[PDB]
Amino acid sequence: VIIDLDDILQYQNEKFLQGTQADDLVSAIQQNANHFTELFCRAIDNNMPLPTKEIDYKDDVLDVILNQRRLRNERMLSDRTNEIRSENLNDALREVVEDETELFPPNLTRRYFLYFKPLSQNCARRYRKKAISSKPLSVRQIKGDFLGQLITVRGIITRVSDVKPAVEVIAYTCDQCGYEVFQEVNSRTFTPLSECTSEECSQNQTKGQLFMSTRASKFSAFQECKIQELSQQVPVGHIPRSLNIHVNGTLVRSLSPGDIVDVTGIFLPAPYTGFKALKAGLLTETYLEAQFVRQHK
Amino acid sequence: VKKVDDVTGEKVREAFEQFLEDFSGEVEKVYRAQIEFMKIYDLNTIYIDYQHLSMRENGALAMAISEQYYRFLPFLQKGLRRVVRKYAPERVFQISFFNLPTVHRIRDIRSEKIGSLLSISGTVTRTSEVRPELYKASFTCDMCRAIVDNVEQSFKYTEPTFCPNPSCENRAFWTLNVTRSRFLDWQKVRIQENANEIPTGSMPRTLDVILRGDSVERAKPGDRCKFTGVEIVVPDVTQLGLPGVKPSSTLDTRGISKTLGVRDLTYKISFLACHVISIGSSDEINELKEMVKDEHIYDKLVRSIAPAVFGHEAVKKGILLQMLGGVHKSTVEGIKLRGDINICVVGDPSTSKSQFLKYVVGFAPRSVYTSGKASSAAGLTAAVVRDEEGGDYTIEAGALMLADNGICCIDEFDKMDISDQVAIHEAMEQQTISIAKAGIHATLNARTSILAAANPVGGRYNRKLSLRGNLNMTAPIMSRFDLFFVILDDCNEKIDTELASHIVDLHMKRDEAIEPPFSAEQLRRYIKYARTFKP
Amino acid sequence: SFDRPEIYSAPVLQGESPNDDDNTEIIKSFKNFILEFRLDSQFIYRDQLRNNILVKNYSLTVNMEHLIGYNEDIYKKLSDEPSDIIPLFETAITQVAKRISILSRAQSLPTFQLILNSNANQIPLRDLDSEHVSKIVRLSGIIISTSVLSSRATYLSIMCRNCRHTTSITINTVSLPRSCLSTIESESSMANESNIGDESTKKNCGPDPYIIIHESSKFIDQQFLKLQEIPELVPVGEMPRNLTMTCDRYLTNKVIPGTRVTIVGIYSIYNSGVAIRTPYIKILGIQSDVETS
Amino acid sequence: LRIIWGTNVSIQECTTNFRNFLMSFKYKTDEELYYIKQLNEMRELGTSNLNLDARNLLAYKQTEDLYHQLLNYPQEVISIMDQTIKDCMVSLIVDNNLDYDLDEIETKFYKVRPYNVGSCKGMRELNPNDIDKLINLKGLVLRSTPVIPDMKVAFFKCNVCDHTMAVEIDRGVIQEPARCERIDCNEPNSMSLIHNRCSFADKQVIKLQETPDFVPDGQTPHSISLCVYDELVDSCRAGDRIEVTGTFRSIPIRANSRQRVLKSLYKTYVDVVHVKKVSDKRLDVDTSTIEQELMQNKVDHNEVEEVRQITDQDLAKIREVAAREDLYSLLARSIAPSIYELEDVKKGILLQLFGGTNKTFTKGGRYRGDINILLCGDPSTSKSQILQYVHKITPRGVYTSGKGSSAVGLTAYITRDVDTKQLVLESGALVLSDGGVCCIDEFDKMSDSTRSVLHEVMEQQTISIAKAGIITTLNARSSILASANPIGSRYNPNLPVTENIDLPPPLLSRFDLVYLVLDKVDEKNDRELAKHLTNLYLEDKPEHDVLPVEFLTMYISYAKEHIHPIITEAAKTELVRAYVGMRKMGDSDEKRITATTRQLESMIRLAEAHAKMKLKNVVELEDVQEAVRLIRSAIKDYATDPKTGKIDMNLVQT
Numbered sequence A: 001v002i003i004d005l006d007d008i009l010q011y012q013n014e015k016f017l018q019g020t021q022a023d024d025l026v027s028a029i030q031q032n033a034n035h036f037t038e039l040f041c042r043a044i045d046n047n048m049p050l051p052t053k054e055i056d057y058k059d060d061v062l063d064v065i066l067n068q069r070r071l072r073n074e075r076m077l078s079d080r081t082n083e084i085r086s087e088n089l090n091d092a093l094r095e096v097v098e099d100e101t102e103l104f105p106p107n108l109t110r111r112y113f114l115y116f117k118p119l120s121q122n123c124a125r126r127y128r129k130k131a132i133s134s135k136p137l138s139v140r141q142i143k144g145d146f147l148g149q150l151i152t153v154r155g156i157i158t159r160v161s162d163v164k165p166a167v168e169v170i171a172y173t174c175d176q177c178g179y180e181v182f183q184e185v186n187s188r189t190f191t192p193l194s195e196c197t198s199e200e201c202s203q204n205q206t207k208g209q210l211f212m213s214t215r216a217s218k219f220s221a222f223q224e225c226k227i228q229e230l231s232q233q234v235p236v237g238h239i240p241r242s243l244n245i246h247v248n249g250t251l252v253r254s255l256s257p258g259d260i261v262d263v264t265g266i267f268l269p270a271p272y273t274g275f276k277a278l279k280a281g282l283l284t285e286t287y288l289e290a291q292f293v294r295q296h297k
Numbered sequence B: 001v002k003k004v005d006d007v008t009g010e011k012v013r014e015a016f017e018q019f020l021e022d023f024s025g026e027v028e029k030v031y032r033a034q035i036e037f038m039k040i041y042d043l044n045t046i047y048i049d050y051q052h053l054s055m056r057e058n059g060a061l062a063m064a065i066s067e068q069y070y071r072f073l074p075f076l077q078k079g080l081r082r083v084v085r086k087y088a089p090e091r092v093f094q095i096s097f098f099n100l101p102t103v104h105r106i107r108d109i110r111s112e113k114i115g116s117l118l119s120i121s122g123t124v125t126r127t128s129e130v131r132p133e134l135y136k137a138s139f140t141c142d143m144c145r146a147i148v149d150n151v152e153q154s155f156k157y158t159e160p161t162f163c164p165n166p167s168c169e170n171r172a173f174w175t176l177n178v179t180r181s182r183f184l185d186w187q188k189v190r191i192q193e194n195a196n197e198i199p200t201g202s203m204p205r206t207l208d209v210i211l212r213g214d215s216v217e218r219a220k221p222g223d224r225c226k227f228t229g230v231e232i233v234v235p236d237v238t239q240l241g242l243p244g245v246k247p248s249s250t251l252d253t254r255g256i257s258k259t260l261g262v263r264d265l266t267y268k269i270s271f272l273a274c275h276v277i278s279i280g281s282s283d284e285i286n287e288l289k290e291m292v293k294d295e296h297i298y299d300k301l302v303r304s305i306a307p308a309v310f311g312h313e314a315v316k317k318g319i320l321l322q323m324l325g326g327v328h329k330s331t332v333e334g335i336k337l338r339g340d341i342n343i344c345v346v347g348d349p350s351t352s353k354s355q356f357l358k359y360v361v362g363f364a365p366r367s368v369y370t371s372g373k374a375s376s377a378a379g380l381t382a383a384v385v386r387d388e389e390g391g392d393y394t395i396e397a398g399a400l401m402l403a404d405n406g407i408c409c410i411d412e413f414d415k416m417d418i419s420d421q422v423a424i425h426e427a428m429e430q431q432t433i434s435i436a437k438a439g440i441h442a443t444l445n446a447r448t449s450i451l452a453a454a455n456p457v458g459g460r461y462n463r464k465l466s467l468r469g470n471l472n473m474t475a476p477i478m479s480r481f482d483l484f485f486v487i488l489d490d491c492n493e494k495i496d497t498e499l500a501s502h503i504v505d506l507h508m509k510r511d512e513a514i515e516p517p518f519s520a521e522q523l524r525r526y527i528k529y530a531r532t533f534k535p
Numbered sequence C: 001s002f003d004r005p006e007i008y009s010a011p012v013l014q015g016e017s018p019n020d021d022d023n024t025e026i027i028k029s030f031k032n033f034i035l036e037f038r039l040d041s042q043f044i045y046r047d048q049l050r051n052n053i054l055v056k057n058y059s060l061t062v063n064m065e066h067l068i069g070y071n072e073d074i075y076k077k078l079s080d081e082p083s084d085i086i087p088l089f090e091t092a093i094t095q096v097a098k099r100i101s102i103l104s105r106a107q108s109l110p111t112f113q114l115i116l117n118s119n120a121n122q123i124p125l126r127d128l129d130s131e132h133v134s135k136i137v138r139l140s141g142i143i144i145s146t147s148v149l150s151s152r153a154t155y156l157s158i159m160c161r162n163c164r165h166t167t168s169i170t171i172n173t174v175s176l177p178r179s180c181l182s183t184i185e186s187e188s189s190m191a192n193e194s195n196i197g198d199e200s201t202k203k204n205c206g207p208d209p210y211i212i213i214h215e216s217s218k219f220i221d222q223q224f225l226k227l228q229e230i231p232e233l234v235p236v237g238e239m240p241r242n243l244t245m246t247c248d249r250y251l252t253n254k255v256i257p258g259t260r261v262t263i264v265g266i267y268s269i270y271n272s273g274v275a276i277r278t279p280y281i282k283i284l285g286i287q288s289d290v291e292t293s
Numbered sequence D: 001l002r003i004i005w006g007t008n009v010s011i012q013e014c015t016t017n018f019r020n021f022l023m024s025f026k027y028k029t030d031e032e033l034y035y036i037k038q039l040n041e042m043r044e045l046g047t048s049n050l051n052l053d054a055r056n057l058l059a060y061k062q063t064e065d066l067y068h069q070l071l072n073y074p075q076e077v078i079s080i081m082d083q084t085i086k087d088c089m090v091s092l093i094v095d096n097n098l099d100y101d102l103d104e105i106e107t108k109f110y111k112v113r114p115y116n117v118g119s120c121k122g123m124r125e126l127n128p129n130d131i132d133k134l135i136n137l138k139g140l141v142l143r144s145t146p147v148i149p150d151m152k153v154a155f156f157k158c159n160v161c162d163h164t165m166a167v168e169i170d171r172g173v174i175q176e177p178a179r180c181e182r183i184d185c186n187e188p189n190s191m192s193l194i195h196n197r198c199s200f201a202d203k204q205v206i207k208l209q210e211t212p213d214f215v216p217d218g219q220t221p222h223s224i225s226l227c228v229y230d231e232l233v234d235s236c237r238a239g240d241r242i243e244v245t246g247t248f249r250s251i252p253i254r255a256n257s258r259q260r261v262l263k264s265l266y267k268t269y270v271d272v273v274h275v276k277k278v279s280d281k282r283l284d285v286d287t288s289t290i291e292q293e294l295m296q297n298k299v300d301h302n303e304v305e306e307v308r309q310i311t312d313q314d315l316a317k318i319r320e321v322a323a324r325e326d327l328y329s330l331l332a333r334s335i336a337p338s339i340y341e342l343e344d345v346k347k348g349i350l351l352q353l354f355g356g357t358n359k360t361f362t363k364g365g366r367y368r369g370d371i372n373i374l375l376c377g378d379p380s381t382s383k384s385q386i387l388q389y390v391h392k393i394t395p396r397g398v399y400t401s402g403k404g405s406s407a408v409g410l411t412a413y414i415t416r417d418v419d420t421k422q423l424v425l426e427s428g429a430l431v432l433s434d435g436g437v438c439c440i441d442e443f444d445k446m447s448d449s450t451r452s453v454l455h456e457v458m459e460q461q462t463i464s465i466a467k468a469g470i471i472t473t474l475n476a477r478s479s480i481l482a483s484a485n486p487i488g489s490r491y492n493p494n495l496p497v498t499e500n501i502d503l504p505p506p507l508l509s510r511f512d513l514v515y516l517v518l519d520k521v522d523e524k525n526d527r528e529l530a531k532h533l534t535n536l537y538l539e540d541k542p543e544h545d546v547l548p549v550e551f552l553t554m555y556i557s558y559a560k561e562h563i564h565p566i567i568t569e570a571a572k573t574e575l576v577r578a579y580v581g582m583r584k585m586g587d588s589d590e591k592r593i594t595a596t597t598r599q600l601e602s603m604i605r606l607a608e609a610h611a612k613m614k615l616k617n618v619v620e621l622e623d624v625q626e627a628v629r630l631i632r633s634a635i636k637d638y639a640t641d642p643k644t645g646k647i648d649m650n651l652v653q654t
């Protein structure tokens, strides 16, 4: 899914011109892009329509698993509601039903990726705004104050890594209690679990041993690219510098060496990696997270 | 607390004892006589032919031992000890099997036979120094001063598991006493695939062989040996990073009251050998006398060298008299006078010089063949392998060191570099190589002979110029080649027809049209005998 | 600079066949007993639990004869291992009370307190001995002294005074952590950097670096009692025997000295010869005979 | 009815469909039941592996869904098929009362190997969502690690009562007992592990050089890692071209040996389930080189076949074709149909492919029928397309340029493995091409240092290495096909060939044949060639009495493998006479290629190759005469002046 900011700006201006109030979602997204991804994902999940085509033998195993998970969710919900009503102890019934039951979170049932694209100079000029996110910049000009923003970089690619699977959520299965345990990961390294964490094994005295299940895990297609300055941007008598870009999801394989491109991305920090002896405080390493690519040819 | 027992292990023990006491136109019994010999001569090992062990009890013992040698070895030791006590009055005893029905290749090993006795053949590449091995340790307890003795190790440093006296309940806290323990001699050897078993388009394999006790220092680098012994496994830390799932071990938490030691199981295959024999008098002194009493013996000898090549009697007479060398002299002032002979054969590529080199390398006892450009300074001379996994450095021999008191064949001699030319020069000057690397200094013997093949500098031997003008060698090395044989082409009809007839005879008839006066074994026997007269 | 990863689960399959003597099955059986047991065609325990929740008294009073009548196995298990079974029944009560309260609200609870009553034969105070240690006993006596109410913690919020790492503790001999937990707890990638600074000096908060924040903690009531044999039956020429009892929460301020009472409790010990220990009782139930109106 | 969680497979439905497909299927010999006779032949011969062509399932109506289920969920489907196959075998034996000895089959195992999975788009084109799917690859083997044992049953002992335990691995984990199971002895933490008493399996890792059909823009070669287990170990040798079918896998790797920390980014490899070592577009490996490997395969009971199968109908057709009298010219015309005329060049290429007879003297001594060829001529002729055809038709070989090579790179080297972090040896081009054809382009730009090594290989087909860590001699039994560009712009016919080519005259005498491709202007030949070339562009796809490539390869392979010509006296006399004649003719020097014994060897090899062609077993006068005529024609001595070594431009015939 591609969210364009020109559409948002048009929506805001349409709301304004006829009087009713509207907030500057454009500025908010521009300044804190990394936080709005989850808001958009949840808003979409609250509205996704039902499938109009049955699931056949020519469909993806991923979709098969997602459908199974959703049906299983519905099954536990209905079973719990029936059991609670049987006791003779509807909004309250529903609320206790959600409270007393476990589910598969929305992120393990989503099947799509979400990306943003910058504000066009033409649209900003027509609406009398300043499109910060679409002003090309060199790696020279990108300083610390730009961290956490959505920015556009103009450069020439020099190196691209192969596509490899990056893990986001690991899944284990407990034979003792039949539960599935999900462990998040957002670091360059992680540690595997050993003993169960489900409710039954937690309360019991004899706990089961977890095992790893690759198919149920949550993987991401990941590439890293190096971008370099153009000749005309380097000041007099200096050497061009570089920058690091990350590509995740369906945007991979879109960059090849020698390409002169404009890349839109969120600027994020990363932990320090130099020598200890030269560390003075909380130093950080930076990278760009890609959202949109535009070729010059 | 009675100890569980292996009825099959015992049964095989008594079966082995019955074999020892029973297996025997004068009849004789071999094993009792060998035990008497061992008592007489103060030895430690017994030699038990595998074949003799087969023709009893329908061979069930033979199999059981073969596929379960590891399990039953202690019971065999126990039976040997008991029979020795019965029929004769600390000693560590060893058994040695040999003469197995078949021999396997290093390329044909499999994990199915782990722990089984078998036989292998290969070429040795390296050997380490003999070092003592911890065999049966002694420990002192800490919370009490109790002493435990004779703790077996079984291929890894093992400690006592529980204090023997209930007065102290110590476990896993001990100190090793190096003053009243026993040790055994221990050596490591590296063997390589033999030349003619290497499959198409592949590089040779290598394998480790552990030698214990008196079998140590029986291998020699550069020889072909047959080993018989057990196949084992040892830990391997390097396998991390390979694809696949590597077994892990974790403790069972079920059934233990409540109110993390995980290990990895990667390994590599090794070989703990028990018998090693090199693989290449008697009535034949009669034939030796008969042949030496000949009168044209020299002519027959000369005719017998390199029968597959036509002519070149002078070159044959050189290859002979290079096989037999002079005598080394020592002067009172310490001056040493050489007794070796070196030969150079000069010719353009179209000639048949390389056949002489191939014949010599195929026939001579200690010989190594090498090409000018496919070698290196380290390949010649020697190298130092400092990464001896258990301790100090070791020396890996080179081409020159190989064939010591032998012959080295150098093809494409004219392409050798200045550095290796200097190395060969030093080898001829003094029979030594000086190694100085990684701060290690050493001197190694190279009492060798050199057979070199050289091409004219311009491709063709310009007969107008002199030998110095035709060759590319340096004056120092050139001065010490006492024989230069230049081979050239002469066009003549009878010679041409004879040569064509000979070649076609070889192709059509193959081995039939060779008929040399003497065979390889006879020639080797004669040379060995004649090499010890010192005229 | 990242946040902390999460962990969670969900049921999919059926594990091994449940065994009878496991905590989950014990809880299920206790819940069934609470919600089903009938006497005179009444749901006595469900009704009184509902009334207690309405009255804001988070306790349930149970009689052991009813339990032995309904089921014997769990009765024996409770009589033999009281310290292990009571928490299970307490959490079952809490689970049921959650549903009752949430339904009633439309139409933040603590752990409910179990109170036991009984009428089986008592044991004279002079016949307690080793065999009764850790079992459940019934006694009769006269109260002679009650101490003043004490204070104990049930939920503590603590902070490390050096690196300001915060955490919480819940009770239901707990001690504060001896060393800072921020090291073993690798919350975030940036936490690893924060755990080091100013060159080579390693981060060490010291021993006992934690302090309690009283503005955000919860406490309960505890009390001590003394019980002595009836003076009538004392042997001649010997002073009587007495014994110490501990009660808490809703069993405080129930009696006054001079009352003749029956007590249901646990025979336990503590350390205050070579291996001697001082016995005492944990109060589970009190029954008065009505004195000095 | 009852699916498996995460999948959509139903065990009952799948097994029923598989049994029905086995009991009813045919190619529509084509009307008879197919898998029934395969099963019967298998149970007759004792084999345990069934090679299933995954395309077959897509024809029958029922299994149109089992095909996709097999592609998507191989793990369950393979086991289901194995169980169904065993049940079918027992049913087949019992329902007809053949014989009552069925315990062996009821006890043994079976396996099914899919080998025709749909086309793949190359390894780099896959995505994370393709893990644990079935795919296939094409590549060239480079290296294979030695056999690695993998534990399957762990053996424990009690150090106080000698009680022994056996534990089975479970998904790669071993559950070590914490207490002795004996009632008398239940001491805690008494179990010890005896490594030598365990039972181990076999595992091997192979490095593959993938050669995808479709290559995107700016993409370079790479390597892949394959895991083989049990029987398949040692079934591949470096230099072989193979087609592999396996499952796509993933795994995390420990950051370091000390810790138990893992890396987020995963490592990918392949798990081999089937290997195909044969093709219809290329010859079959010369069985004279893999003698021991065949016996090893028979011992190991691995069912991989090295050479293709031949039917009685095919043999009859081969005999019929060999019976005719224009076979030689027919085959010559067949080789490289896209190349016009050059009849003698094509004949030489054919004879090279056929090769001579390999003698072997008991008591030591080797002779090989390899034939070396060098091409000289005008730069603009079709002397390079010949190299491509031979490279793509031969089983093994490497195509190299003179200036882009090195002495070490042609023989061997030592390199650090990036995974195991140790040093391992690797093979050069000349060793990789063992048993095949090595193509060298621009042989006259190669340095003297580089050219030095070719002498030994062309002399005795071996290479001797004395380098750090290795001292040994390797086989290099490969033929040489080389091309060269004459000095300057055009081959001047007013100078001797030695003054035209930039090679030492002595080196030329080693080659068996030397070809001079001269370009002469003639209207008829120009018209013919121009029409031939222009015809190819008449329609968007090719449509050009020529045998098909499959039949040609089948014939050549059969001839190479099944016959061995021998020489006779009538041939010997002619050989001697012709060699003496050559030595005499031409007897002031460096005007021609001086005759030597290599020429007599060339006659022997070429006569043997001609006799081997046309399915004979005795070399004779016709073969000898043809060989001598071809040798003379290659250098076209008929148009040469035997006094000055010049060419008469008007005598050569196009």
Ligand SMILES: Nc1ncnc2c1ncn2[C@@H]1O[C@H](COP(=O)(O)OP(=O)(O)O)[C@@H](O)[C@H]1O
Residues within 6 Å of the ligand: D338, D339, D340, D341, D342, D378, D379, D380, D381, D382, D383, D384, D385, D529, D533
């Ligand atoms: N006899 C022929 N048959 C078919 N094509 C030919 C012939 N002679 C020349 N050609 C054409 O001319 C070109 C020959 O160039 P090429 O063979 O690459 O040069 P080289 O002499 O280096 O091999 C090819 O494109 C080919 O199509």
Ligand SMILES: [Mg+2]
Residues within 6 Å of the ligand: D383, D384, D385
């Ligand atoms: Mg070309």
Ligand SMILES: [Zn+2]
Residues within 6 Å of the ligand: A174, A175, A176, A177, A178, A179, A196, A197, A198, A200, A201, A208
């Ligand atoms: Zn669990």
Ligand SMILES: [Zn+2]
Residues within 6 Å of the ligand: B141, B142, B143, B144, B145, B146, B163, B168, B169, B170
């Ligand atoms: Zn002790």
Ligand SMILES: [Zn+2]
Residues within 6 Å of the ligand: C160, C161, C162, C163, C164, C165, C180, C181, C182, C205, C209
């Ligand atoms: Zn702290």
Ligand SMILES: [Zn+2]
Residues within 6 Å of the ligand: D158, D159, D160, D161, D162, D163, D180, D181, D182, D185, D186, D187, D190
């Ligand atoms: Zn035991």
